[PDB]
Scaffold this active site. Structure first.
Site, PDB file in Angstrom:
ATOM      1  N   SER A  31     -12.589  -5.237  53.751  1.00 15.01           N
ATOM      2  CA  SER A  31     -12.866  -3.821  53.504  1.00 15.01           C
ATOM      3  C   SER A  31     -13.439  -3.600  52.102  1.00 15.01           C
ATOM      4  O   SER A  31     -14.000  -2.532  51.824  1.00 15.01           O
ATOM      5  CB  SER A  31     -11.590  -2.979  53.753  1.00 15.01           C
TER       6      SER A  31
ATOM      7  N   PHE B 235      -8.329  -6.741  53.399  1.00 12.37           N
ATOM      8  CA  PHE B 235      -7.384  -7.547  54.173  1.00 12.37           C
ATOM      9  C   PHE B 235      -8.067  -7.914  55.479  1.00 12.37           C
ATOM     10  O   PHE B 235      -8.327  -7.030  56.306  1.00 12.37           O
ATOM     11  CB  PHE B 235      -6.094  -6.780  54.422  1.00 12.37           C
TER      12      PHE B 235
ATOM     13  N   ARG C 122      -0.990  -7.813  46.806  1.00 14.99           N
ATOM     14  CA  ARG C 122      -2.361  -7.821  46.279  1.00 14.99           C
ATOM     15  C   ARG C 122      -2.552  -6.802  45.151  1.00 14.99           C
ATOM     16  O   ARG C 122      -3.523  -6.905  44.414  1.00 14.99           O
ATOM     17  CB  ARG C 122      -3.395  -7.565  47.387  1.00 14.99           C
TER      18      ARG C 122
HETATM   19  C1  LIG Z   1      -9.940  -4.234  55.154  1.00 16.76           C
HETATM   20  O1  LIG Z   1      -9.566  -4.979  54.422  1.00 16.76           O
HETATM   21  C2  LIG Z   1      -9.163  -3.663  56.311  1.00 16.76           C
HETATM   22  C3  LIG Z   1      -9.931  -3.455  57.621  1.00 16.76           C
HETATM   23  C4  LIG Z   1     -10.640  -4.703  58.100  1.00 16.76           C
HETATM   24  O2  LIG Z   1      -9.002  -2.984  58.605  1.00 16.76           O
HETATM   25  C5  LIG Z   1      -8.466  -2.344  55.913  1.00 16.76           C
HETATM   26  C6  LIG Z   1      -7.127  -2.107  56.602  1.00 16.76           C
HETATM   27  C7  LIG Z   1      -6.084  -2.411  55.571  1.00 16.76           C
HETATM   28  S1  LIG Z   1      -4.390  -2.811  55.860  1.00 16.76           S
HETATM   29  C8  LIG Z   1      -4.194  -2.781  57.685  1.00 16.76           C
HETATM   30  C9  LIG Z   1      -4.940  -3.847  58.467  1.00 16.76           C
HETATM   31  N1  LIG Z   1      -4.117  -4.516  59.468  1.00 16.76           N
HETATM   32  C10 LIG Z   1      -4.553  -5.598  60.121  1.00 16.76           C
HETATM   33  N2  LIG Z   1      -3.850  -6.080  61.126  1.00 16.76           N
HETATM   34  C11 LIG Z   1      -6.738  -2.433  54.393  1.00 16.76           C
HETATM   35  C12 LIG Z   1      -6.123  -2.515  53.082  1.00 16.76           C
HETATM   36  O3  LIG Z   1      -6.942  -2.817  52.117  1.00 16.76           O
HETATM   37  O4  LIG Z   1      -4.918  -2.333  52.952  1.00 16.76           O
HETATM   38  N3  LIG Z   1      -8.101  -2.344  54.509  1.00 16.76           N
END
Ligand SMILES: *C(=O)[C@H]([C@@H](C)O)[C@H]1CC(SCCNC=N)=C(C(=O)O)N1
Ligand SMILES: *C(=O)[C@H]([C@@H](C)O)[C@H]1CC(SCCNC=N)=C(C(=O)O)N1
Ligand code: NA
Lengths: 246, 245
Positions: free
Chosen positions: A48, A189, A231
């Site tokens: 993300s 993540f 993190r």
């Molecule tokens: C990016 O890093 C993710 C995106 C790919 O969903 C989002 C979601 C989250 S935490 C929940 C994801 N659960 C997976 N099973 C984040 C975050 O940075 O906390 N970014």
């Protein structure tokens, strides 16, 4: 531009049985420190954190109209209830609303998306894997060091994008505000990965503290979502013990 | 249009405060207040003037850009917090008067007058010294007018480049949370003189989900110990309306 290894910091990693890396750079001395020089240059899926370049590219291409654009929720199920709403640009970034940005990448298209990741020197610049997935499950990879270079460029408005659009994305990235300092940041993540091949979790951004600026990028292996808060906890502890945000 | 909300009076009387809160959801075209009369009463802007002053500094090139550092010459300044080099956001957040006084001097009377007219900034009166008209001079602006001004800024509709309005807006972020951002500016003119209180301000706006609330608070103040009320009364109101917190 210098980087040095600071094996000290390793305590905050060892405490929590975490394998990862922190890169912290002071803009005024153009000097960076990391616990692990090798891992700092190792490239991982951006997950993300890609929402930063993606947002900039969407603005530059017109796909995102402006700072006030509302991405309307069309009612159909999304993989997270947090995502099941209307969202501002900041809102969709803060909540990491993947489907908002998948549609943006779709409208950007492969050709402009590749043109901009080359101009931005973003990672390995590999967008193979589907226009709405390459940063999630495809072949795109970027280092912690490349992140901080990219973020430093954005901060200085030196990316190949209008200054207006860089300012728009910077304010959307504000995550903590105090009288003495501002934090801009983005989490990532990729998931828990596979047996023997963990996912990756990210925290990137920069801290404006008095007249100084600190660019930072954290990544770690992760096979348990329980560990996600680490993190921020490990870099924050590091940044506090440097006197930056604590 | 501005409509009185009696309910809000409780927080003022509890604290024995004479003041006003103005709150406008979405736009300035309909605002709510505890006191219709005071909502449009014009007061010295004090440090809140740093907002238009920052915009005008940028527009004229007096402030070269977003990354300008205002260097401290090492000579005594009126608050120790001001005795340091400062970025634009820093100079706003600590309300470093002498930084903005030099800005005003370099902008100068003719340009300052022009921009305040363009901005519809209060009574647009800058007499009283180029480096002090918003501090002890004749300039006055109301809570409603601050809301109108901030709404224009939020919308990039002031007579100023979009870039410069974006710069100042980032310098005004004071609270960031996952669900909302607050852009705001405090002010305090001093404790006034017998039967003529000073004024304390808090103005700004809240971006929450897809909604925006513009707010402007002022009170009479003759004792600096009352100063925390400038934030806690409007915060309490906005928390009870479900906007922040
Ligand atoms: C990016 O890093 C993710 C995106 C790919 O969903 C989002 C979601 C989250 S935490 C929940 C994801 N659960 C997976 N099973 C984040 C975050 O940075 O906390 N970014
Ligand atoms: C602007 O409103 C003033 C500036 C003109 O001095 C600054 C000062 C303060 S309060 C500091 C304590 N005052 C003692 N005289 C503020 C404020 O917003 O609170 N802004
Ligand atoms: Na703040």
């Amino acid at each position: 531009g210098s980087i040095t290894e600071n094996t000290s910091w390793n305590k905050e990693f060892s405490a929590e049985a975490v394998n990862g890396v922190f890169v912290l750079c002071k803009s005024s001395s153009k000097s960076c420190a990391t616990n692990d020089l090798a891992r700092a240059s190792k490239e991982y899926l951006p997950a993300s954190t890609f929402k930063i370049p993606n947002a900039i590219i969407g603005l530059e291409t017109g796909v995102i109209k402006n700072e006030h654009q509302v991405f309307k929720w069309d009612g159909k199920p999304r993989a997270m209830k947090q995502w099941e709403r209307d969202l501002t640009l900041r809102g969709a970034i803060q909540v990491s609303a993947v489907p908002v940005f998948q549609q943006i990448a779709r409208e950007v298209g492969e050709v402009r998306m590749q043109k901009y990741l080359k101009k931005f020197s973003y990672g390995n610049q590999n967008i193979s894997g589907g226009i709405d997935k390459f940063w999630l499950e495809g072949q795109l990879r970027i280092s912690a060091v490349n992140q901080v270079e990219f973020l430093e460029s954005l901060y200085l408005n030196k990316l190949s994008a209008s200054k207006e659009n860089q300012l728009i994305v910077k304010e959307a990235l504000v995550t903590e505000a105090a009288p003495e300092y501002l934090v801009h940041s983005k989490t990532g993540f990729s998931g828990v990965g596979t047996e023997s091949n963990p996912g990756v979790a990210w925290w990137v951004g920069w801290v404006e503290k008095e007249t100084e600026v600190y660019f930072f990028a954290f990544n770690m292996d992760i096979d348990n979502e329980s560990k996600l808060p680490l993190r921020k906890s490990i870099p924050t502890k590091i940044m506090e013990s440097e006197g930056i945000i604590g």
